[PDB]
Amino acid sequence: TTTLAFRFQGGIIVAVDSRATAGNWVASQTVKKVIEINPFLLGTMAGGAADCQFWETWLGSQCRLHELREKERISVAAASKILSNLVYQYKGAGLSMGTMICGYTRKEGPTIYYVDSDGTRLKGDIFCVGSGQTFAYGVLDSNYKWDLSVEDALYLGKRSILAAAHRDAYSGGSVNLYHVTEDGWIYHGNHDVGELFWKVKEEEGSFNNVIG
Amino acid sequence: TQQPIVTGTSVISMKYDNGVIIAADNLGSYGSLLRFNGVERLIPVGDNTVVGISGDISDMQHIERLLKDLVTENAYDNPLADAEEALEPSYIFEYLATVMYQRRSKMNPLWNAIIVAGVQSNGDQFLRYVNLLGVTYSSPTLATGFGAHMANPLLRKVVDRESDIPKTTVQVAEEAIVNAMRVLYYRDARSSRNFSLAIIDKNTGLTFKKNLQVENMKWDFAKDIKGYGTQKI
Amino acid sequence: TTIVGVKFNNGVVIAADTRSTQGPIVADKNCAKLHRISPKIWCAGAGTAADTEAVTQLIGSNIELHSLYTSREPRVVSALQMLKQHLFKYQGHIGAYLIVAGVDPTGSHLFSIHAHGSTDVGYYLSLGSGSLAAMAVLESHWKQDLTKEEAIKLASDAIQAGIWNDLGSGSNVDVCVMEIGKDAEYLRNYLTPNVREEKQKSYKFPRGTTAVLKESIVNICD
Amino acid sequence: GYDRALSIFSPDGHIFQVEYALEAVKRGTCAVGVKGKNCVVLGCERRSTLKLQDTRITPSKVSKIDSHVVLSFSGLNADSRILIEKARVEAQSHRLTLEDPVTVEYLTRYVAGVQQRYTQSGGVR
Amino acid sequence: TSIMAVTFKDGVILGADSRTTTGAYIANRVTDKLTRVHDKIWCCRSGSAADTQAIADIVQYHLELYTSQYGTPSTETAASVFKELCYENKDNLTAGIIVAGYDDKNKGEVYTIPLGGSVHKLPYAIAGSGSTFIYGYCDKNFRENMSKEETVDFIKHSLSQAIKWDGSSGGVIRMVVLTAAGVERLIFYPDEYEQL
Amino acid sequence: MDIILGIRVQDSVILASSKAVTRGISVLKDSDDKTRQLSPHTLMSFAGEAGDTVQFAEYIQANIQLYSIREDYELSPQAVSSFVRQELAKSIRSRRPYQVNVLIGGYDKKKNKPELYQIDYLGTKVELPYGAHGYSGFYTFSLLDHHYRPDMTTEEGLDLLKLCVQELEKRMPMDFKGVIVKIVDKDGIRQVDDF
Amino acid sequence: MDIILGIRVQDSVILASSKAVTRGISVLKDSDDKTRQLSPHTLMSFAGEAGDTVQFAEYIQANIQLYSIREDYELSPQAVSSFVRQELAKSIRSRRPYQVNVLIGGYDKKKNKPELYQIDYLGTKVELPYGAHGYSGFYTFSLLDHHYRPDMTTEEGLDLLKLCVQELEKRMPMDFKGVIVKIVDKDGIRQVDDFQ
Amino acid sequence: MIEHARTAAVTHNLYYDEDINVESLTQSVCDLALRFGEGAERLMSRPFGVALLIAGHDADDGYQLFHAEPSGTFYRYNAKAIGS
Amino acid sequence: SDPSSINGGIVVAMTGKDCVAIACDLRLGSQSLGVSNKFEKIFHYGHVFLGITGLATDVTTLNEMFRYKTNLYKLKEERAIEPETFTQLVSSSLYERRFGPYFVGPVVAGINSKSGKPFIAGFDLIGCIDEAKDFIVSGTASDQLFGMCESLYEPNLEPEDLFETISQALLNAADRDALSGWGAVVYIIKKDEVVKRYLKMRQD
Amino acid sequence: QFNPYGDNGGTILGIAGEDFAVLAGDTRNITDYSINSRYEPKVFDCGDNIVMSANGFAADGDALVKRFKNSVKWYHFDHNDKKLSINSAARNIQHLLYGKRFFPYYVHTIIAGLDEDGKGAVYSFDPVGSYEREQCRAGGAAASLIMPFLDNQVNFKNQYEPGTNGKVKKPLKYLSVEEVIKLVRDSFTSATERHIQVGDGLEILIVTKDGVRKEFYELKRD
Ligand SMILES: C/C=C\NC(=O)[C@H]1NC(=O)[C@H](CC(N)=O)NC(=O)[C@@H](NC(=O)C(=O)[C@H](C)CC)Cc2ccc(O)c(c2)-c2cccc3c2NC(=O)[C@@]3(O)[C@@H]1O
Ligand SMILES: C/C=C\NC(=O)[C@H]1NC(=O)[C@H](CC(N)=O)NC(=O)[C@@H](NC(=O)C(=O)[C@H](C)CC)Cc2ccc(O)c(c2)-c2cccc3c2NC(=O)[C@@]3(O)[C@@H]1O
Ligand SMILES: C/C=C\NC(=O)[C@H]1NC(=O)[C@H](CC(N)=O)NC(=O)[C@@H](NC(=O)C(=O)[C@H](C)CC)Cc2ccc(O)c(c2)-c2cccc3c2NC(=O)[C@@]3(O)[C@@H]1O
Ligand SMILES: [Mg+2]
Ligand SMILES: [Mg+2]
Ligand SMILES: [Mg+2]
């Protein structure tokens, strides 16, 4: 599992893979690791499949309750802190989760929070979580800049997920892309790693390490 | 129960054309000691069900108490308790199975393997199995413990599939059960020569035979066994 | 693995299944478990398959050398004693459980050897995972003064019970008969009950289905 | 333990205890609030003006629930203290779980809900 | 396993069951637990079948060489060989042995070697898993210098009770009688010693 | 552990806290403020197990702010330290104790004096001229034992803290990505912009 | 662990090694050369358990220098890599195995080509354009997968290595106090004096 | 009551990935109406003093309007007026 | 963790009409981290091919040992070793270290130079001779390869069809294992021609 | 200590076509290296054209099946006999499974049916409830053996169009019920050949817009 989310001039870029494994066995490669909390809040999962999926859907329910109660969208801070307090109430029980809550509000702007089962909650600009977070982090920090275009930032997120899928054995399948702006989240397609790798190799002159 | 103490050995059972047959030893084993002889491990419920239990004898007696209490409670306010609303084998099974799975999920199981065998009200032969894990399955031949390893292969040579059940007679099935009991007495250290046998037949009812003994044993060739290899005398 | 041995009035038969499993997965669907220690002394093995093969081959080599040295026919008691002492030396760490039968100048012989180095003698014996089923069959149908066909049928039925009622034994039945006045007869696939049905399809891919990046002719000569 | 239904309906459709609480309110000192274009003023009445009274320590009619919300009351002073404590606790809890001070509407709704629960619970007035 | 050896006027008689078990399964229900290390020196084995067989083979080899060199061995000599083998390899063995022999000088003698390698000469020796159940019966029924038939009956009753109560013992009762007249092999079947 | 340092200077208390939070083999953040303003004249830096730290800090902050609103009065630093110590001492023998260590620095206005308290997750409170949590002290204390002086100025305290940070960056196996330095005095709490 | 990186560019091999040695909670030295010149055209960087590293490195150095003197000839990088791999593979099944991972960079003069080998303490040898030992690769590899190019120059390789070191210093929990950078080419082995 | 309704609705979504039927929501709301009395789970002292018009739409029974009284009873009206 | 599952990899051999085929994955990695995309596991001595899956260092050591032994065998016998003889040699060499085994799973394939018969066989880590006429599989994805083979294989395939079958089996089994993949090679072997093909597969 | 879990083997398979779904399972219930029964079905019809199978621990599987059937009964009771959507059933099964997040049902769960648009659909659940809608999914003992085959023959993985220079994938197409029956039969014959916990019999439930039908086929009994 490898997920990344980073802020730039055009809002937030989010990019995940789709591989879920049970040890050496690739259980599935059609896993949607971005949870659409609401048209303005996204949740990226990493770790416990059932844990993350169930609790992020529950977070979406809680956000709907907050919106109905206060007649106002829930803030990224409050949305992340709900799940943070939940997992901390379940701390030491056996939960394994590393998630990123990304959103755009008028009060906060674009905002990204990292929340794990240990109870940590961190507001940040660039986050990579999962077994292959290191390769992502590498490519990102090497090619990151706040003045990226929407196109360039989407391409950078996709390429970081691609590198993490290549190197890390537990990450792969396909890349799911998302752009979070003032108007909400926009899905930018599901790209099969099998074809995306060859495309990037031919178009970039990179991945010269592969025999293909 | 966390560890069994006094335990009963295998319980074997099989279907035939008009009903079912079950059998079990009369032995209560205190580990490696054959402590209690004359321990009935076949509990007849009604005129149509028999429950064969292996494992912790205390839990078997608890299940006996539960079966008696279930009969008593079914008799309450039931004018047809002696007829259409009597205790069916499927009812008794499902109850025992729910109990076993509950006690498993509470981490305090009944250290037993249970085989419920009887005839339903419509003449159907019921024969099913449950254990301390609550696992349930039903086959034309059912055995517990060593029986599952030795009795079942012999009993399947008579009824290897459902279609063989109408062809098997009561004599064939009973002879097979007695032969399997003899084989168990041969090759089971925690077994006894005295056993009990129940027949639930959709026409003759419940036939319960106690104080049976394994007979026609072949031991003469033991005189020709001398030494463990090269010894000649 | 299900191995059995039955002595009849003029010799001894051994039989086994043909299933080698790497845990819960079948690895060989026709494994030969009958090993030749001597032209008239055979052995069925169960347990660590490599251990059984190695110990049978080593004792067979030693038996051939001993028979050349003494210019006499190898005796089943000799193979029995050597196997016993070898297995006991290794404190049972050689996971080989054997049923060794044969015919020598002293007559017919049938023994069983436990991997820790213990030996038993009898007219009918069985070992392996499905040993219990086969032993139940034996105790049900065995009698004294069996004919050749009677002992063959008994051993084959024991192996069949092992195949049908044990997850660790399956495929086909192998048999080896050893009579006093004749040569040993090694019937491979004496019974082939587990034959696979015809597949509902033929998955012969159309050529060009697989994508290839580079080809090369390999030089195998000099 | 004590769950006697004190606030119940009357044959004419009236909850008497609520109206008598309103009457107790009508017997308390006066309080007023006025909204400006960019400010809010709260005025309160002092019980005449006694001379043996120490005005430095006696609680004032206006109490702060948070740094940005104030509360005046009319009626029984003790019930006012209870409501003020509950409101301050809820304001701090909302700050803790939302990382944002409460709105006047939210605090007002919380106080109203507390009072409504007290009008429909057993063993309490 | 239930084994015993009893001395009497005419010599000695060993008795055992025929049940070799791996756990709760009867590995062999016709086992010959009475092993011979010399013409009139036999041993009852209990415990690890492999260890007992190895010890018995080595003791028989040593006694055969002793016979070829220095003449017919004494029962005490076989007992000492067993004792050395068991005591020097106590950490890797699990064998209880009862060595019974007959000679013209000492008539019939019985030695017992439990775990640890100790050796004790007794008028009668009981050992095995079942022996624990027949301690009282044997202590109350054993007599000095019984007749052949009385010794056979005593061993039969003791081993039958042991087989009845002990699930680790069963099969048939095997007996070997060593007297001046020689070696006699007796067998008793379940349909006879169960009705005792 | 993390870098949590505190030094009590004449008329001020300075608190330094590492900016790095690392989970696994990746440094997740390099700009983490490990402090919480309990009151306008009392700050608390914290470090320990992930999750428990911020939870305990914000809980203490909420309780102190509730006490401040209820009484319209600011608790003395001594009282806040005693409250935090009692909370930790009740926590240690609970089902899941808080594993957080805290430094509390505050300017007591009724005494017009700076105060610094060190409390571990067990509830052992001490008032020290300088304190540290984790392995940091194992170095810094020595320096202070040599360089501390009671009549120091706030700038001299900042220079001493810079010496401590240099020693840590030299001889510590972990890269804590600098420190956030805050000063608590009679005029409240400020944050040194360039350290 | 320590940072051990290597990158093979056209006509050069670059090796980077941590400068920090830390025992306990104290950094004992910040200028440690974790390499040994096996031969004038073959260098080996190493990292692993304290003690075993320098011991194994100096042992390999002694053996390679002895072979060079005996034959008056320098072994190709392939031969040195195979020899050290065999040494490690014999060590793993010894009583106390060597826990050292090595990168070997050399300019094959008979082929006039740069070569880089990666071997772990197990004896797993690979020929790679770039390699790393420990956690370092978990970052650096990605960068290389994006930025490596076969027709690069030694300066371009140095810039890529600097990018890798920057990423490591950004996202690594440990402060390895920079790296020593060495270049192996047709003219032998040289050391970049100032890298950051 | 409104709270109990809203949460219930969202909960039916969370448990079933679909919108709750109008009649089901109205019935769940009415389940609170007669949850009053003395004794004691403690229940409220008095029934509700408010009536509700619950309007909605689902794919099963189209557009729906329900009247909910503190009597625990609810009706379905094509049109309904409550109050003065 | 497990010695055989540190590096990962898969090898599969199949037979057809007057031909054999042996394919392997091209991945070498330290558990999660992938290191090398060029680690082939099928070596050849004369006309006998051996694929070795498992601990990489043991793979290389056994390759060098078998090269050594086959060279000495050819020198002493003045002929190339046959696949059956080489299989017996592999079994004996494996059992020689019974109590300290090589954590590998060898697979021998080839065509008997004299009889012209196709021969394949497999072993465990202690040398158990597993000789099948259809297919032999080994590696971390042994179960996936078993399923793919038992489903797709049919006897008497021509080289062009046997190649497609073995390639599809290898690829679809590798896509279901995280520790195998990153490339693949397939050798198709006839009596006097061996063709080596690099397959294209997903690189994750 | 008492071990509250056990493995009964078994293998289940689920495929979704154009206007139909199919859920098949082996009828062999086993324990350790012994067979408990040769016909103990585990693919059940629950109503509303929804077939379910939770393979693994037999006790937990039966408990989960009973709980889901009770849940559909109460869903009909409490919502005016509204039809339970397949996605709604999947969500409810996720919640059922996650209810024992810390004492899970040792079962892999697979349900099959038709979606709101009347097209085939399968849903897969790990033992704690991470659910996913798919077109093919195998679970149980032989899952690792069947799943790649499906990927090759249902989703056409690694299959490029011949001559397209490995650039054009094979056109993905919906399969007929006859084709999925063929694939299921071949998958289960292979599983019976190579896995010792699979065999005896294959029972297939086919869910179309016309309802649920059954097909039984014999399997090897080794
Ligand atoms: C979030 C995005 C991708 N998620 C993953 O990619 C993760 N995969 C899964 O959770 C698989 C998926 C599947 N089978 O569909 N499910 C299980 O394991 C499930 N059962 C089992 O553990 C069992 O059998 C038990 C014996 C009985 C229930 C549930 C579970 C339980 C405890 C855990 O601590 C984890 C998962 C866990 C947590 C953190 C990371 C990972 C985990 N488990 C791993 O295998 C992984 O490592 C991988 O990262
Ligand atoms: C014909 C005689 C027996 N027939 C069988 O069919 C027996 N199988 C085998 O001996 C297989 C055969 C093969 N092709 O490898 N050997 C291994 O698995 C080898 N281990 C390995 O490779 C591994 O470490 C992998 C990780 C796992 C596949 C060697 C080994 C190691 C420890 C053991 O305790 C046994 C074998 C063992 C001993 C007694 C009985 C049995 C054993 N193992 C079982 O699986 C069986 O139960 C079966 O009875
Ligand atoms: C001497 C006359 C009758 N002897 C018996 O009747 C005895 N049975 C056997 O020795 C079986 C026979 C067989 N062919 O299998 N052999 C083994 O157990 C072998 N170990 C194995 O199998 C194993 O892996 C496990 C260790 C055992 C399940 C050899 C062995 C090793 C260590 C031991 O401490 C004993 C035996 C041991 C000692 C005292 C009594 C008994 C023993 N073991 C028991 O099983 C018994 O209880 C029974 O009394
Ligand atoms: Mg990957
Ligand atoms: Mg893979
Ligand atoms: Mg099978």
PDB file of N, CA, C and O in Angstrom, chain I residues 23-42:
ATOM      1  N   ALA I  23      10.877 -21.861 -17.695  1.00  0.00           N
ATOM      2  CA  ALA I  23      10.714 -20.425 -17.563  1.00  0.00           C
ATOM      3  C   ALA I  23      10.935 -20.020 -16.117  1.00  0.00           C
ATOM      4  O   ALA I  23      10.686 -20.797 -15.190  1.00  0.00           O
ATOM      5  N   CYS I  24      11.413 -18.793 -15.934  1.00  0.00           N
ATOM      6  CA  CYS I  24      11.659 -18.289 -14.592  1.00  0.00           C
ATOM      7  C   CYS I  24      11.397 -16.793 -14.551  1.00  0.00           C
ATOM      8  O   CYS I  24      11.407 -16.105 -15.579  1.00  0.00           O
ATOM      9  N   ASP I  25      11.152 -16.301 -13.338  1.00  0.00           N
ATOM     10  CA  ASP I  25      11.005 -14.865 -13.142  1.00  0.00           C
ATOM     11  C   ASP I  25      12.375 -14.209 -12.965  1.00  0.00           C
ATOM     12  O   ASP I  25      13.383 -14.872 -12.703  1.00  0.00           O
ATOM     13  N   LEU I  26      12.399 -12.882 -13.098  1.00  0.00           N
ATOM     14  CA  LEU I  26      13.639 -12.114 -13.160  1.00  0.00           C
ATOM     15  C   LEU I  26      13.828 -11.194 -11.956  1.00  0.00           C
ATOM     16  O   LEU I  26      14.531 -10.184 -12.048  1.00  0.00           O
ATOM     17  N   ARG I  27      13.219 -11.526 -10.823  1.00  0.00           N
ATOM     18  CA  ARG I  27      13.230 -10.657  -9.655  1.00  0.00           C
ATOM     19  C   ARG I  27      14.185 -11.168  -8.587  1.00  0.00           C
ATOM     20  O   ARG I  27      14.222 -12.365  -8.286  1.00  0.00           O
ATOM     21  N   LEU I  28      14.960 -10.246  -8.022  1.00  0.00           N
ATOM     22  CA  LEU I  28      15.720 -10.485  -6.804  1.00  0.00           C
ATOM     23  C   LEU I  28      15.500  -9.300  -5.880  1.00  0.00           C
ATOM     24  O   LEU I  28      15.742  -8.154  -6.271  1.00  0.00           O
ATOM     25  N   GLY I  29      15.044  -9.571  -4.662  1.00  0.00           N
ATOM     26  CA  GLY I  29      14.774  -8.499  -3.727  1.00  0.00           C
ATOM     27  C   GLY I  29      14.942  -8.954  -2.296  1.00  0.00           C
ATOM     28  O   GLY I  29      14.882 -10.147  -1.985  1.00  0.00           O
ATOM     29  N   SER I  30      15.159  -7.974  -1.422  1.00  0.00           N
ATOM     30  CA  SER I  30      15.270  -8.203   0.017  1.00  0.00           C
ATOM     31  C   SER I  30      13.889  -7.954   0.615  1.00  0.00           C
ATOM     32  O   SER I  30      13.549  -6.834   1.001  1.00  0.00           O
ATOM     33  N   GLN I  31      13.086  -9.017   0.672  1.00  0.00           N
ATOM     34  CA  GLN I  31      11.710  -8.954   1.151  1.00  0.00           C
ATOM     35  C   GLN I  31      10.895  -7.952   0.343  1.00  0.00           C
ATOM     36  O   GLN I  31      10.606  -8.186  -0.835  1.00  0.00           O
ATOM     37  N   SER I  32      10.528  -6.830   0.965  1.00  0.00           N
ATOM     38  CA  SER I  32       9.668  -5.860   0.294  1.00  0.00           C
ATOM     39  C   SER I  32      10.416  -5.111  -0.801  1.00  0.00           C
ATOM     40  O   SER I  32       9.847  -4.816  -1.859  1.00  0.00           O
ATOM     41  N   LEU I  33      11.684  -4.790  -0.565  1.00  0.00           N
ATOM     42  CA  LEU I  33      12.457  -3.992  -1.506  1.00  0.00           C
ATOM     43  C   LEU I  33      12.923  -4.848  -2.677  1.00  0.00           C
ATOM     44  O   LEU I  33      13.535  -5.902  -2.481  1.00  0.00           O
ATOM     45  N   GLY I  34      12.629  -4.394  -3.894  1.00  0.00           N
ATOM     46  CA  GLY I  34      13.158  -5.022  -5.091  1.00  0.00           C
ATOM     47  C   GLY I  34      14.496  -4.409  -5.455  1.00  0.00           C
ATOM     48  O   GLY I  34      14.649  -3.185  -5.452  1.00  0.00           O
ATOM     49  N   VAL I  35      15.465  -5.265  -5.770  1.00  0.00           N
ATOM     50  CA  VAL I  35      16.848  -4.850  -5.971  1.00  0.00           C
ATOM     51  C   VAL I  35      17.275  -4.986  -7.431  1.00  0.00           C
ATOM     52  O   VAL I  35      17.775  -4.032  -8.028  1.00  0.00           O
ATOM     53  N   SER I  36      17.083  -6.164  -8.024  1.00  0.00           N
ATOM     54  CA  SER I  36      17.618  -6.464  -9.348  1.00  0.00           C
ATOM     55  C   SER I  36      16.515  -6.969 -10.266  1.00  0.00           C
ATOM     56  O   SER I  36      15.732  -7.843  -9.880  1.00  0.00           O
ATOM     57  N   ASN I  37      16.471  -6.431 -11.487  1.00  0.00           N
ATOM     58  CA  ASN I  37      15.526  -6.863 -12.509  1.00  0.00           C
ATOM     59  C   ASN I  37      16.132  -7.868 -13.479  1.00  0.00           C
ATOM     60  O   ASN I  37      15.483  -8.230 -14.466  1.00  0.00           O
ATOM     61  N   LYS I  38      17.360  -8.327 -13.223  1.00  0.00           N
ATOM     62  CA  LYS I  38      18.082  -9.177 -14.163  1.00  0.00           C
ATOM     63  C   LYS I  38      18.585 -10.468 -13.526  1.00  0.00           C
ATOM     64  O   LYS I  38      19.549 -11.060 -14.023  1.00  0.00           O
ATOM     65  N   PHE I  39      17.963 -10.922 -12.440  1.00  0.00           N
ATOM     66  CA  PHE I  39      18.428 -12.118 -11.738  1.00  0.00           C
ATOM     67  C   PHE I  39      17.745 -13.338 -12.341  1.00  0.00           C
ATOM     68  O   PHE I  39      16.674 -13.761 -11.903  1.00  0.00           O
ATOM     69  N   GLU I  40      18.374 -13.912 -13.362  1.00  0.00           N
ATOM     70  CA  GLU I  40      17.874 -15.140 -13.958  1.00  0.00           C
ATOM     71  C   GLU I  40      18.174 -16.325 -13.050  1.00  0.00           C
ATOM     72  O   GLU I  40      19.180 -16.352 -12.337  1.00  0.00           O
ATOM     73  N   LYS I  41      17.281 -17.312 -13.077  1.00  0.00           N
ATOM     74  CA  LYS I  41      17.397 -18.472 -12.209  1.00  0.00           C
ATOM     75  C   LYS I  41      17.557 -19.778 -12.972  1.00  0.00           C
ATOM     76  O   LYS I  41      17.623 -20.839 -12.342  1.00  0.00           O
ATOM     77  N   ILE I  42      17.632 -19.734 -14.298  1.00  0.00           N
ATOM     78  CA  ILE I  42      17.800 -20.924 -15.122  1.00  0.00           C
ATOM     79  C   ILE I  42      19.200 -20.886 -15.715  1.00  0.00           C
ATOM     80  O   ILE I  42      19.523 -20.004 -16.520  1.00  0.00           O
TER      81      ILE I  42
END
